Amino acid sequence: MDVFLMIRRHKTTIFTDAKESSTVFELKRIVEGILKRPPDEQRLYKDKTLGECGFTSQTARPQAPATVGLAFRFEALCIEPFSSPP
Amino acid sequence: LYTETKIFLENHVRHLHKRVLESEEQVLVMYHRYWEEYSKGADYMDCLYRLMEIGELALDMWRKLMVEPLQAILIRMLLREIKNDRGGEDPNQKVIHGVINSFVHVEQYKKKFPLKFYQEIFESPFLTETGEYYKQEASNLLQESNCSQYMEKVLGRLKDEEIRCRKYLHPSSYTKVIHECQQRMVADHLQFLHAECHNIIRQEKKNDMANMYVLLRAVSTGLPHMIQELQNHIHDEGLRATSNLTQENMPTLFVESVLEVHGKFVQLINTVLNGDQHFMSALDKALTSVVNYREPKSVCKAPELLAKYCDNLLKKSAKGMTENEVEDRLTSFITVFKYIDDKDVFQKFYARMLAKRLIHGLSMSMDSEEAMINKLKQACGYEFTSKLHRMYTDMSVSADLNNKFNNFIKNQDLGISFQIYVLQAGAWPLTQAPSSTFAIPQELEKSVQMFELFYSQHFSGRKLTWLHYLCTGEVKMNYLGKPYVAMVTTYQMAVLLAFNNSETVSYKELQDSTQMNEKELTKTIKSLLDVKMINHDSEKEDIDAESSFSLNMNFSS
Amino acid sequence: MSLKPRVVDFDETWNKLLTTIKAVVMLEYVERATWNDRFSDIYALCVAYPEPLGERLYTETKIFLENHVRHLHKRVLESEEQVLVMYHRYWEEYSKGADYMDCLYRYLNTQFIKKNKLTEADLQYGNEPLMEIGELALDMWRKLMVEPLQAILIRMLLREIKNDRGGEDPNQKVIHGVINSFVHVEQYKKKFPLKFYQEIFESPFLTETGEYYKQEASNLLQESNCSQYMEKVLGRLKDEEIRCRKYLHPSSYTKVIHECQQRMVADHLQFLHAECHNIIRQEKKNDMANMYVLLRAVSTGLPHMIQELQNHIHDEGLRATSNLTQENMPTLFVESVLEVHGKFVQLINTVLNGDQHFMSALDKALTSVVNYREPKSVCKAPELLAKYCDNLLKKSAKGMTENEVEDRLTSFITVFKYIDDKDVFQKFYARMLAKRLIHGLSMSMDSEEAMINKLKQACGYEFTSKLHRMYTDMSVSADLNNKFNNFIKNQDLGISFQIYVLQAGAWPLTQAPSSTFAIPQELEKSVQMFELFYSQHFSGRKLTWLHYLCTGEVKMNYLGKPYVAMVTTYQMAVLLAFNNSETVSYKELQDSTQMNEKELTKTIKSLLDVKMINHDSEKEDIDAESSFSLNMNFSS
Amino acid sequence: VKKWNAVALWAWDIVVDNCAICRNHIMDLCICTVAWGVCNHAFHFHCISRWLKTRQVCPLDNREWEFQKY
Amino acid sequence: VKKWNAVALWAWDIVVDNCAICRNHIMDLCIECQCTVAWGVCNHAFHFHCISRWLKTRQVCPLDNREWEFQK
Amino acid sequence: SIANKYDNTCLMIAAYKGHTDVVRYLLEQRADPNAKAHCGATALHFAAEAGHIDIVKELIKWRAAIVVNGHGMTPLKVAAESCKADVVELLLSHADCDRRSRIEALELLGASFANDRENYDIIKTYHYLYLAMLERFQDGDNILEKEVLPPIHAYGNRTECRNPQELESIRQDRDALHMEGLIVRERILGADNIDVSHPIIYRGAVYADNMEFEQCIKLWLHALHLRQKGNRNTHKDLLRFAQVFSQMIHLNETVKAPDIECVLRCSVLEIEQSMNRVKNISDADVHNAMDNYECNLYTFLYLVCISTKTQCSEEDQCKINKQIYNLIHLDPRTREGFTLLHLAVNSNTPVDDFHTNDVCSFPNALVTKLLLDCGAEVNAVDNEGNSALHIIVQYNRPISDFLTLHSIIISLVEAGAHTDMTNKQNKTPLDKSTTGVSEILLKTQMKMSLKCLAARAVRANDINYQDQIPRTLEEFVGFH
Amino acid sequence: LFKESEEIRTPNCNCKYCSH
Amino acid sequence: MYVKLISSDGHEFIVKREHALTSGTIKAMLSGPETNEVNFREIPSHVLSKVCMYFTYKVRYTNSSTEIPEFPIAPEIALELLMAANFLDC
Ligand SMILES: [Zn+2]
Ligand SMILES: [Zn+2]
Ligand SMILES: [Zn+2]
Ligand SMILES: [Zn+2]
Ligand SMILES: [Zn+2]
Ligand SMILES: [Zn+2]
Ligand SMILES: [Zn+2]
């Protein structure tokens, strides 16, 4: 019912929260608002409702947000993984 | 010669009438100028000609052949100029006033109808059109404005048309103009601000009442409405001041509650309302109802607390407030004392409470007590405090009688100082008349003998009463290791007599000393047991003649 | 990272910090990357792994700040006529410098400075101690710049203010800033934050305040008139209360205004009480407003002014009632005293703001007016208030409407409160209620009830216990008289008696004679009729039957035309013995009258006054022998 | 013949009977016209005079005795 | 025996001799008993039996001329 | 003659009881009755103390000698102090005597009966003081004046009488005969290391019975000093000293002056210091002194109990607060931990002698508050590893004194109590607390940080802390 | 009702003033 | 109304203003002499991930009656489990 959302595109990473009832189109709009891009150049891509994708408040947590995934152009994903722990 | 002069006057009037009709839209100025010429010539020539006077006939001719024929035109001119002046346009004031004075002068000689022609030619249509203009203007203002600005503009206009009338109008018609404008302005809208007033009075905004009251006083029919409305308002506030008071400190706050409300509300009437009496009377009615209602469930508690309230000043109190400030609160207390519902209810309270004052010497100063007595007298007559005065004289005399007893002592032992108080039952209300008989102890047995000789030589046809139960005295118990002083009653002291000789005493003996019934003496010994000076030899609560009691050798007091 | 580095030579890394902090505390443009690197380096130092390095930093920064302050002071001093102007700018810079410096490094402020400190306990109970950076950087601006220039700056600032008593003001904000800096220097202290500002600024200011206005007041008073001086003073206090709002800390207005008061007015007060006599006497209005406002600051001002005002009323009270119209003793009196109390009420609310004290003065003022007047012996004043209440309630042609009389009784109460001995008033009022209503009604029943209603609430609730039932007593009169008529139905000259049922000890008629005139002769049927009806309805109570002094109308039948004239029980019965015989001997009446001769012949003498009989014996005194004859010519 | 007015003073029967100081008829009998004062106490006039010449104070409340009206 | 103060009332007896109801001394018993004594809030004193008799005959005070009452 | 450690020989203790039959054999056995004790007493001196005329008969038969002991008192004055007039009569009848001690003894003999606890006699007070005074004025040539002593607030500014006229005029006032006697004893026995405390306690106790609390306090105040000159423990005198205030303060007679309490506490300041200094003197022997030391510690609380109830201007507390911090900085160390803050909050069981009442209550709210108002160390830890909040949660009857239990926690979270602390075996404040309602208030006052319990994860792993952490942070590992 | 200190004399040190 | 955190590893996390204003030292840098700029040069990226998560935790689950869920800390912590708040005053 509430899922914390993680934006991974190359270096950048963006944090916030949204409701499952929201649609992909609204999240597209939020991304455009925060990054100043047109919707066509935006392409949302996980690895009417955010729950129609397979997400739940049980998997996603304020402290343990379920790993999600996104990308940007129509170039494929290029995500640098975090550093290895010592 | 007079008739021939009239003929030539007709001739010149005809000439001037032709000259006037020749004038195109210039009729007013030239006619006025020829009017002054005519008037001055008439003055000269009537001074020459000093059946009726030539001057009056000349004035009548002047009026008949110009004023009457040209009356429609001149009236239209006047109404147009008046409408212009209402619109801010400035006409020739000199011409207008001069023509008005011409109307005044033409019919001035005739004792009958001095301005009636003057009124009918101009005043009636003028008033009609002016009333119509105020009707239209007031409708326009009410359509697109609120009450306050409308009233302020009405006042400003009232002054402006007053100025204009003083510029032109005769002194007689100011009242008529004011009446007609008043009828036009308010006669149709004085019933809307009567409901709004309830919010205005609730708003408690100082300027709001003042802005409304300036003209609400002028209108008559509305005046009763606010008076009740204001009376209801303060009555609503008064009951609000009743609720927040607590029961524990009720006597002190009750005085403060009315004072805190009375003080702040009176100045409101003086400032905004010019301190009219009618509003003050309404306050008293509601406040009396506030006083009439009693927050404590006990009836007449407000008079009941009042005696205790006054007793605080009356009783010797640690940290005494300034006697000057005391006089101030006492004079303030008089203001409340009017609102009392029943004085005799308070009088009963005051008398009973006053009893303890000379019992225990609660009053710090005897003169302060006297001040109230004089203050009360000025309020409600002599008979209201007849006993309250004879009683005071009774105690002051006792000082000399004790000295006369001291003189009698010179005229003359228990070894113990004996004190005497002499009173009067009619002055001093003690309904408790003891029916039982008490045997006097040995020590007072001496005191009785000398008093009779003392009393006989000084007083005749008299009698004195001995109430022993009310007598109180402190007694120090000697046999205690640490001496202790405790106040005990005389009836106890009679019972206390048999404890010194024998520690354990049966109940039967003490009745012989008291010579009064054991059932009431049972409460006496029971009262002694609770003090625990003696410890009962029987654990039972009930006390009979058989039961004995053991003296407590180690009792501490 | 962020671990312990093995070695860091502060002798090497200190130079970057010394390069950047000097720039920072002078408000030049700094660079962000250097800004973060400086935090990095400070954390790196604050924990040096071989030996923690805490105090060297402290010492170096102290010395650096001290040198900077002195270097500023040297340029500050050698500048004439601009010393405070430049002081302003330098202070305004260094202030913000201090806060930015504190906000730069905090880790030292909170992990090595705090843990070794001195509590306020030992401070109260008691080597220079350790202390936080910001307040050190601020405090060092005391022991170097303020003390050596203290005298110069105080003198210059006082010169500026002294010139500012003139209309123009050289400058508005600079002096405000230099004054306000004194307070803010001592931001952190345990107690008495204002002690410095009070110690080094207040005293010269207050002492200089007095003399300027002392001299100005002298100059004004020596060549000014009382009203002129009174007007002049009010402006200057407002001027100074405006002035203090600029150049001072707000919490010192009170002492300044207070000193102005005690040096402007209170020391010239001997002059103000000198003219307080006249200004009241000419009844002038304007000076009241000024005189009242000015005194209340000093305590002793009011008492003399009140006592003077009161003595003015006492004259106007009596002179308004010097002489009275004999025709209108009740009317003229109440009308005069009523208005004087009216007019002086408006004055108090108009000008003196309705002080509670003044309204007390009026009450004692009039109690010397109404409660007594010197002539006409004593007690003449309180009695006549009845007569005004009598005729106002007597049947008056063109009688005032019920509304206006009602208000008339409401206005009557105000005069009532002043009369002292109300006891005599009751006795005079009761006698009236007797003779009014029995002889002839005067006003409607409700109106007569209205007066009783006010008195009941007015004073002494239930000393009007007497007379209260009287209104009810006549009310029930005819009502039961109907019940008497019912018995009359079951069982004469058309005569019915009033019921006279009313309490003893009230309604005072008294006048009990011994003779009692015996009984009427013409008829006795009347008496028994009452008793029979009365006995069954009333039992266990007495019978009074005061048959004398009982009014009754008579229809005499000796003339052709009977006439209506008042006749009393004693008199009319004597007339009845005259019906049969024109000439009657004296002794015959005494057999019938059974009453004292003086009053018998006094009633007969009453006959002679009306000339209704002719005495046969010439001498006016009548004995038993003397006879008398009927008056045939008499008509009524 | 047109109208009479009959007046008197009505009260209880046994509350007041005679003079308190001297139990005699209220008129011309004492062990005497009715006397009145400020305190308004009535006793036999001979008794009034004798008491006054013994004690000028009121017999009931020891107040001043002035002959008010009767 | 350390200290004693005397309080005394001064009055007379010649003023009142008998009950207004029982026609016998108020202190003494009522005519029926020769008892009990009652008091009203107007401080009028009569025998309780006298008061009860008068009240059952009439609910009027002998002196105050109102509804007779009991203070205690 | 072989004696004990205190040099009391066999025949020294024979005459102590008074059985002359044994002593009669001993002296006839050529035994010396003049052997000196540890102070220096002799059988005659014991006979002077004992006052048995029977034993002295054998002593005079065997020519016993006069010896002054270490206290500096003659046996002739000992009989005067022993209140044995008959033995005085015999020794005044003795062939060899010195008149110097006779006057000195008789003046003290007169002061002996006046100040006597049980055998007090005012007749012997005047009779023997007058006889001694006449011995001074027995000769006009030599005029002996009883030297006056400096006026004292304890003595009420009285000087020693010098003439019979003064003595004759003061026969009327019993206390004046009482009051003069103390000066005689003080003047004479001041040089001697001999106490005069017993008379002053008798005077105060009677004054305690006579409501003369003003005099008894001042009289004992000098008696406090009298104990000090003799280097004698005042704690027993202090033990009764506190109990005196314990009654009348409860009775609310007068609580006017706390500045005197400053003098009282300043007096016990060095006493506790000396008590602490005594602890420094001996280590094993102070085992029982610990309780007396604890008693002095208890008096502190009871003094605070009085200090809490009494109120005055802040300057008096400023005088009071100064020496408090001295106690604070001085070691409050107690066995099994339990410093004063520990002992102030817990059930303060060692209370008695009217202190087991409302004056000294176990929950004591304000006293714990005022201890923090003094500024003691909040985070002190017992050897058990217990904290300040480790004890307050361990409180029975939470409903009783509910406001007090709430009130203490209000201040304790302030001034730096570490919210959750574990020492030795794991003891979270939740764990130590056993009452749910109390734990609720603990939950209300929590404040969430990061490391304050995040570090606790490392104990679950327990990697090497040392040489991997800054210097100051190493304790946060230790705390958790 | 008011108690008194014991002041028990030590048998070994028989002198009153010297107490332990 | 947005702030950016940069690390030594090149990554750039962005969150809202208040979540950053939780700490003290962060406001210290932001108070020093449009999108603002902050640079931590001496820290890896793992700890910044965790610190952002804690910001979310504190802002959400403050002072709520419902039981607060636990935080799944990792095994390999060592230094940050102390220094995290000893340098970022958190
Ligand atoms: Zn007679
Ligand atoms: Zn009589
Ligand atoms: Zn009388
Ligand atoms: Zn009776
Ligand atoms: Zn009876
Ligand atoms: Zn009655
Ligand atoms: Zn922690």
CA of residue C210 relative to chain centroid, distance: 37
D28 labelled binding-site residue: no
For G13, the closest of F6, F194, F195 (CB atoms) is F6
For the sheet with E4-11, list strands across it.
Answer: B418-423, E4-11, B463-466
3-state secondary structure of C613: strand
F476 assigned to some structural domain: yes
Residue that the structure tokens 């030619």 belong to: B121
CA of F35 to the centre of ligand 2 (A): 114
Q: Which residues of F touch C122 (CB under 8 A)?
A: 325
Altogether, the residues listed in chain F come to a count of: 480
3-state secondary structure of A1: coil
State in words which class domain B299-380 has.
Answer: mainly alpha
- Looking at CA atoms only, how far is residue E68 from chain B in angstroms? 17
The amino acid occupying position F407 is S
Cβ neighbourhood burial of F214 (10 Å; 0-12, 13-18, 19+)? exposed
Experimental method: cryo-EM
Q: How far apart, in whole angstroms, are the C-alpha atoms of residue F115 and residue F201?
A: 10
* Ordered alpha helix ranges (H), F254-351: 259-281, 287-309, 314-329, 340-345
Q: Which residues of C touch F321 (CB under 8 A)?
A: 121, 124
Taking ligand 5, which is a single-atom ion, which protein residues have CB atoms under 5 Å away? E 30, 32-33, 35, 49
3-state secondary structure of C594: coil
Q: Six-digit token pair at C51?
A: 């030996």
E35 labelled binding-site residue: yes
Instruction: Inspect the interface and report whether the beta carbons of C423 and B381 lie closer than 8 Å.
Output: yes
Q: Do A and C make contact, counting contact as 3+ CB pairs within 8 angstroms? A: no
Resolution (A): 4.3
Q: How far apart, in whole angstroms, are the C-alpha atoms of residue F289 and residue F298?
A: 13
Architecture of the structural domain at B204-295: Up-down Bundle (1.20)
Nearest to residue C573, comparing CAs of C497, C513, C517? C517
3-state secondary structure of H37: coil
Interface of F with G in 13-32 (CB under 8 A): 13, 16
Judge whether C504 is closer than 8 Å to chain H, CB to CB: no
Judge whether F370 is closer than 8 Å to chain C, CB to CB: no
Q: Which of C341, C349, C379, C418 to mutate to test the interface with B (most CBs of B within 10 A)?
A: C349
Say if B2-185 and B204-295 have the same CATH topology.
yes
CA of residue F391 relative to chain centroid, distance: 31
Q: Six-digit token pair at A7?
A: 């934006």
Residues F469 and H79: beta-carbon distance below 8 Å: yes
CA of E16 to the centre of ligand 2 (A): 15
Residue that the structure tokens 């009950």 belong to: E19
Q: Which residues contact C614 (CB under 8 A, 6 or more apart)?
A: C628, C629, C630, C631
For B381, the closest of C349, C410, C463 (CB atoms) is C463
Q: Which residues of H touch F469 (CB under 8 A)?
A: 79, 82
Residues after which a C–N gap over 2.5 Å breaks chain D:
31
Nearest to residue B488, comparing CAs of E5, F359, C238? E5
Instruction: Inspect the interface and report whether the beta carbons of H60 and A62 lie closer than 8 Å.
Output: yes
CA of residue H88 relative to chain centroid, distance: 8
D22 labelled binding-site residue: yes
Q: How far apart, in whole angstroms, are the C-alpha atoms of residue D35 and residue F262?
A: 84
Mode of pairing for the β-strands spanning A12-19 and H12-15:
parallel
Nearest to residue C585, comparing CAs of C576, C594, C577, C595? C577
Judge whether D39 is closer than 8 Å to chain E, CB to CB: no
Domain count, chain F: 1
Q: How far apart, in whole angstroms, are the C-alpha atoms of residue C317 and residue B450?
A: 62
Q: Which of A59, A63, A80 to mutate to test the interface with H (most CBs of H within 10 A)?
A: A63
B472-551: what fold? Ribosomal Protein S5; domain 2 (3.30.230)
Architecture of the structural domain at C150-264: Up-down Bundle (1.20)
F326 assigned to some structural domain: no
Residues C334 and C388: beta-carbon distance below 8 Å: yes
Judge whether B2 is closer than 8 Å to chain E, CB to CB: no
Judge whether B380 is closer than 8 Å to chain C, CB to CB: yes
CA of residue F380 relative to chain centroid, distance: 30
Q: Tell whether domain H3-87 is in CATH 3.30.710.10.
A: yes
Residues D27 and C520: beta-carbon distance below 8 Å: no
Instruction: Inspect the interface and report whether the beta carbons of G15 and F194 lie closer than 8 Å.
Output: no
F71 labelled binding-site residue: yes
Residue F402: CB atoms within 10 Å: 11
Residue C110: CB atoms within 10 Å: 13
Residues A37 and A54: beta-carbon distance below 8 Å: no
Domain ranges within chain A, ordered by starting residue = 2-86
Judge whether C363 is closer than 8 Å to chain B, CB to CB: no
Residue B164: CB atoms within 10 Å: 16
Instruction: Supply the CATH classification number for the domain C269-369.
Output: 1.20.1310.10
Q: Six-digit token pair at B516?
A: 């009064």
D19 labelled binding-site residue: yes
Residues C301 and C269: beta-carbon distance below 8 Å: yes
Q: How far apart, in whole angstroms, are the C-alpha atoms of residue B81 and residue B89?
A: 8
Residue F43, phi then psi, degrees to nearest 5 = -55, -40
Q: Which residues of H touch C39 (CB under 8 A)?
A: 25, 28-29
F458 assigned to some structural domain: yes
Judge whether E72 is closer than 8 Å to chain B, CB to CB: yes
Q: Which residues of C touch E57 (CB under 8 A)?
A: 540
Residues H22 and H59: beta-carbon distance below 8 Å: yes
Instruction: Inspect the interface and report whether the beta carbons of C503 and E65 lie closer than 8 Å.
Output: yes
3-state secondary structure of B412: coil
CA of residue B247 relative to chain centroid, distance: 27
B2-185: what fold? 5 helical Cullin repeat like (1.20.1310)
Domain that holds residue F460: 451-480
Residues F450 and H54: beta-carbon distance below 8 Å: yes
Taking ligand 7, which is a single-atom ion, which protein residues have CB atoms under 5 Å away? F 452
D41 labelled binding-site residue: yes
**Ramachandran region of residue B355, left (φ > 0), alpha (ψ -120 to 50) or beta?**
alpha
Domains identified in chain D and CATH numbers: 1-70 (3.30.40.10)
Domain ranges within chain B, ordered by starting residue = 2-185, 204-295, 299-380, 392-458, 472-551
Instruction: Inspect the interface and report whether the beta carbons of E10 and B466 lie closer than 8 Å.
Output: no
F283 assigned to some structural domain: no
Angle formed by the axes of helices F314-329 and F259-281, to 10°? 10
Residues F305 and F252: beta-carbon distance below 8 Å: no
F456 assigned to some structural domain: yes
CATH fit for domain C511-636, picks 3.40.1710.10, 3.20.20.70, 3.30.230.130, 3.30.70.330: 3.30.230.130
Instruction: Inspect the interface and report whether the beta carbons of C540 and E65 lie closer than 8 Å.
Output: no
Judge whether H39 is closer than 8 Å to chain C, CB to CB: yes
State in words which class domain A2-86 has.
Answer: alpha beta
Q: How far apart, in whole angstroms, are the C-alpha atoms of residue E70 and residue B140?
A: 75
Nearest to residue C607, comparing CAs of B201, C588, C577? C577
Domain ranges within chain H, ordered by starting residue = 3-87
For G15, the closest of F13, F39, F209 (CB atoms) is F39
Residues after which a C–N gap over 2.5 Å breaks chain B:
50, 412
Encode burial over B328-358: b for 16+ CB neighbours within 10 A, e otherwise.
eebeebeebbbbbbebbbbbbbbbebbeeeb
Q: Six-digit token pair at C503?
A: 């309490």
Nearest to residue F129, comparing CAs of F101, F104, F93? F104
Residue C216, phi then psi, degrees to nearest 5 = -65, -40
Q: Six-digit token pair at F358?
A: 């409302």
Judge whether H42 is closer than 8 Å to chain C, CB to CB: yes
Instruction: Inspect the interface and report whether the beta carbons of D3 and C510 lie closer than 8 Å.
Output: no
Q: Kindly list the distances between the CA atom of residue C531 and the CA atoms of C23, C69, C537, F159, in Å, as whole numbers in the listed order.
A: 128, 125, 10, 106
Residue C361, phi then psi, degrees to nearest 5 = -65, -35
Q: Tell whether domain C10-139 is in CATH 2.30.110.10.
A: no
Q: How far apart, in whole angstroms, are the C-alpha atoms of residue H73 and residue F455?
A: 10
- Interface contacts (C, H; CB < 8 Å): 41
Q: Kindly list the distances between the CA atom of residue B187 and the CA atoms of B181, B182, B184, B197, C205, in Å, as whole numbers in the listed order.
A: 10, 7, 6, 18, 66
